[PDB]
Ligand binder design. Structure first.
Ligand SMILES: *[C@@H]1O[C@H](CO)[C@@H](O)[C@H](O)[C@H]1NC(C)=O
Lengths: 49, 48, 49, 41
């Protein structure tokens, strides 16, 4: 039994990661979170959880 | 103000499911077989 | 597990078994028990037996 | 023994970071100006 809830994923699909490229139009899937866009260093702050 | 309100409503409507499992169809496509994914996609398309 | 070619039934409900390796989950449960042959079909949602 | 809870006791209902929004969410919270106990010890 699996579930999709708000906490960060713990057990995840096993496949080799890669590097990350910035300032380019690339496709990505951050540990499940899939999308497409230009990855840019941000200036906002995140509460560390 | 009227134009802004209408456009904001239109863009908020992208966050609904209309009966599908998930609002975003990227997740629908990333964890379903196309013969079964199309069932959800139909409802989402009609809603939009 | 999918390519084990030794499991009588493997049907998934939420996901697709072939795409299952690519997902990423918050947490997963695992139950185990022994039953007879003519009530395996009773292990399904919306089933009475 | 009975003090009044002012505008206090609100948490972050989720983790999705947001800024400069007026997000609304239905969950379990302390009603504003609720009748709370004052267990003294
Ligand atoms: C809280 O409950 C007590 C119970 O006797 C009551 O006397 C008191 O008036 C209540 N607080 C307020 C603000 O009404």
């Amino acid at each position: 039994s699996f579930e999709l809830l708000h906490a960060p994923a713990t057990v995840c699909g096993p496949k080799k990661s890669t590097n990350l490229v910035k300032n380019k139009c690339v496709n990505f899937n951050f540990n499940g979170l899939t999308g497409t866009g230009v990855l840019t260093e941000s200036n906002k702050k995140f509460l560390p959880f | 103000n009227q134009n802004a309100q209408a456009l904001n409503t239109l863009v908020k409507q992208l966050s609904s499911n209309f009966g599908a499992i998930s609002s975003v169809l990227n997740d629908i496509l990333s964890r379903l077989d196309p013969p079964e994914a199309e069932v959800q996609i139909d409802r989402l398309i009609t809603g939009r | 597990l999918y390519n084990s070619a030794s499991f009588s039934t493997f049907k998934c409900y939420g996901v697709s078994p072939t795409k299952l390796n690519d997902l990423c989950f918050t947490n997963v449960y695992a139950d185990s028990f022994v039953i007879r042959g003519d009530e395996v079909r009773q292990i399904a949602p919306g089933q009475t037996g | 023994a009975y003090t009044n809870s002012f505008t206090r006791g609100v948490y972050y209902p989720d983790k999705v970071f947001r800024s400069s929004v007026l997000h609304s969410t239905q969950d379990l919270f302390l009603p504003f100006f609720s009748n709370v106990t004052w267990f003294h010890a």
